[PDB]
Amino acid sequence: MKLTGKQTWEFENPLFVNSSGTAVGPKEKEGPLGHLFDKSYDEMHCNQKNWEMAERKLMEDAVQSALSKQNLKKEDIDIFLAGDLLNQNVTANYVARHLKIPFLCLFGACSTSMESIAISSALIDGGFAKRALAATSSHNATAERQFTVTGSGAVVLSQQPGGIKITSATVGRVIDLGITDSQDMGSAMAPAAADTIKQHLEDLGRTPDDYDLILTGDLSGVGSPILKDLLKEEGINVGTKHNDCGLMIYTPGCACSAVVTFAHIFKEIEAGRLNRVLVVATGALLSPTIIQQKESIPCIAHGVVFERA
Amino acid sequence: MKLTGKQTWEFENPLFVNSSGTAVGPKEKEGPLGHLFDKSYDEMHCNQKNWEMAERKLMEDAVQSALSKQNLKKEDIDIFLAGDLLNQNVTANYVARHLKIPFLCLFGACSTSMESIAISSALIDGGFAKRALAATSSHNATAERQFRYSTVTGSGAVVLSQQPGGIKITSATVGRVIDLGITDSQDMGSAMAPAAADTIKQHLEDLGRTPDDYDLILTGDLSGVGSPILKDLLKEEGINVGTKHNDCGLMIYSGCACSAVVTFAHIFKEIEAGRLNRVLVVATGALLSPTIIQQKESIPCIAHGVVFERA
Structure with a gap:
């Protein structure tokens, strides 16, 4: 069993983060980590028509940065795990449609960033996927729609050696x-x-x-x-x-x-x-x-x- | 690898549906299959105060049916995969809190019923869980909220594991x-x-x-x-x-x-x-x-x- 204790999965086979990508808004760009993000926009629309397309652009940016760093195409990924951190997967489903990668849709909560990596890790370690893409996004401008960082992060994982296990x-x-x-x-x-x-x-x-x-x-x-x-x-x-x-x-x-x-x-x-x-x-x-x-x-x-x- | 072709997972180890549970409303009760559901209610509120408690009761009924048929307690389950059609954190999340089972929250859509079983299946076949519970639910009275501002009123849950059962x-x-x-x-x-x-x-x-x-x-x-x-x-x-x-x-x-x-x-x-x-x-x-x-x-x-x- 890879389950250890009550709630912890211990992966038995080599498992690595091969690349990651991040895209953020102006508030993040001006912050202490501003220079570390792959994409960072001077204004909250992220050069897009509206808030929806803005957050979609942030996730597409983060995903393409991660893929670019390994010279991967969307067809090179076996499984895509993603959800919005705030909304009803309005961004994730649109990006999944464009990537055409088999898609496991997760419920958007701020815990989704690690939920998506955990599941991706189990699937790769269990022999169900060679490479997984995990991504989440949020946009301060639409965070009110419940009754917040503006950005998106994506990671590519596989059994192929990377800098991080x-x-x-x-x-x-x-x-x-x-x-x-x-x-x-x-x-x-x-x-x-x-x-x-x-x-x-x-x-x-x-x-x-x-x-x-x-x-x-x-x-x-x-x-x-x-x-x-x-x-x-x-x-x-x-x-x-x-x-x-x-x-x-x-x-x-x-x-x-x-x-x-x-x-x-x-x-x-x-x-x-x-x-x-x-x-x-x-x-x-x-x-x-x-x-x-x-x-x-x-x-x-x-x-x-x-x-x- | 368990991945076969482009998108298909083929489980290599014994994998079974040990039991299932269904709870439905009056409309389903009156239908051709009404007699097959484990629990049914004569009115859509399901003895509850509002539509949110009604859908929650339905999922709790279905989960309890599945667990009871195998003499299992909530503590006997390692992972719970579920989602509900409104994506309002109303039902599945509420039920997960009461069950206290490690929870993987899925985005509710009519496709979630099989998505939850597929993931449960991989986690079991991969040695990450011994038993998994998967459930979904919907309610006719709040189905309009997916579009604004014919849907089944019910919930189905299944218990999966490597223990021999009638269905693989x-x-x-x-x-x-x-x-x-x-x-x-x-x-x-x-x-x-x-x-x-x-x-x-x-x-x-x-x-x-x-x-x-x-x-x-x-x-x-x-x-x-x-x-x-x-x-x-x-x-x-x-x-x-x-x-x-x-x-x-x-x-x-549809x-x-x-x-x-x-x-x-x-x-x-x-x-x-x-x-x-x-x-x-x-x-x-x-x-x-x-x-x-x-x-x-x-x-x-x-x-x-x-x-x-x-x-």
Whole structure:
């Protein structure tokens, strides 16, 4: 069995990130990581007619950057796993239609960036695909349509040697402790990130000392301190080992886990500044209906371990 | 490799449907198959306060039926694959929270019924899970919300594992998105046929098979209008299904969402009874949302297939 413990998949065959691509808007371009993205636009329309075509252009850009880096055509990919981080896959389905790659459509939450890589990894490791493409996108301009980073990240994975290996993934379970305040996203998502991180370490018999970095996505300032405290209650001390993507992309539930992980964290690993990193993307599973009814907001966090090859 | 041809996964290890569960509304109860569903309700609210709690109760019923028939508890399942037709985080997410099973959230479309089984199947065959639960649901009363601002009222769930059962799963074909330019939200049957045809053709080609190798080729929700088109398209590719084709949308009472409940309640019984030995089930989905319809964009469609056989 490749399932280790309760929720962690340990891949047994060689598995690598062969290339990645990122495309972002102006707010991201002006931030500390602005120069690391493959595409970065000076204005939010991304030279497009409207917001829909803007986000579609961001994903197409990110995907073509990833493919270009390996001189791959769309026909060279066996499976495509993608979803929007915010909307109802309005972008992902359009891009899938153009790529013509067999398509597994995932539900768009901020956890989708790692959910798509986890599934892609299992399919490649299980012999169901030679190469997989995983992608997600979001656009600040349309993030309101529930009752946010502007960008998209894509990765190409395969068993062919690359600078970064994927060694395990932990699938999260939905966690909902009550929060209904659509603006209290930090306090709602933290318990999910905590459960997934705790289960991952328990499953692999590891501690934060086995990681160079434990990176969360989308907890930002409010959620991070809560996550650390919750982990301490479980006897898990992340210490200075924890950082959040929402905290690195802008100067002094924003779906930024993918573009920061792909544009920045992967570069750090390939440069040998980080050897093993646990990345946990956390999503608030909501939408108009949920909020329209003042219901609690369920959250989920999925994790993936990347290591220098 | 388990990948065969371009888009077909052939499972190399023992893989079975251990049980299934279906829960439906009054309209389905009154239909020709009404007697085959595990649970049915006399009124669409299903004893619940609103349409959201109604659909949630239906999925909880179907999942509990599937689990109960095998004497399993929610803790006995390693992975849960599910989605619901509104994509409002209302049903599947709610049910996943209560079950506490590691959850892979799929985008709801009428094609999700087979997408969830295909992924579940690969994860089991790949050693990533011992048992998987897959479920989908829809409700007639909120079906309009996919387009704005005939759908089945029910839910089907299945428990899968390597433990011997009456029904084996031998392959699955993952579809690619096909879009020939149909904008009309109710010419959905015709927007979906091309996707269903592409998947059936590729599935047959990948495995070096013809319709003669199947006792039944069943499409999910093409219904009255889409079925003739599908057969015409397959013929244009030199594939003659003849009388081997049927559609779930024609057996329960397009974009109907009846694929899972008809397959689970009816088709599975036919296979276990020995009346059908190998069946290709292809669920077809129109990938849309109000944003799509609102801007009168063409409607992308996708079809995923799974082959079920008598053990």
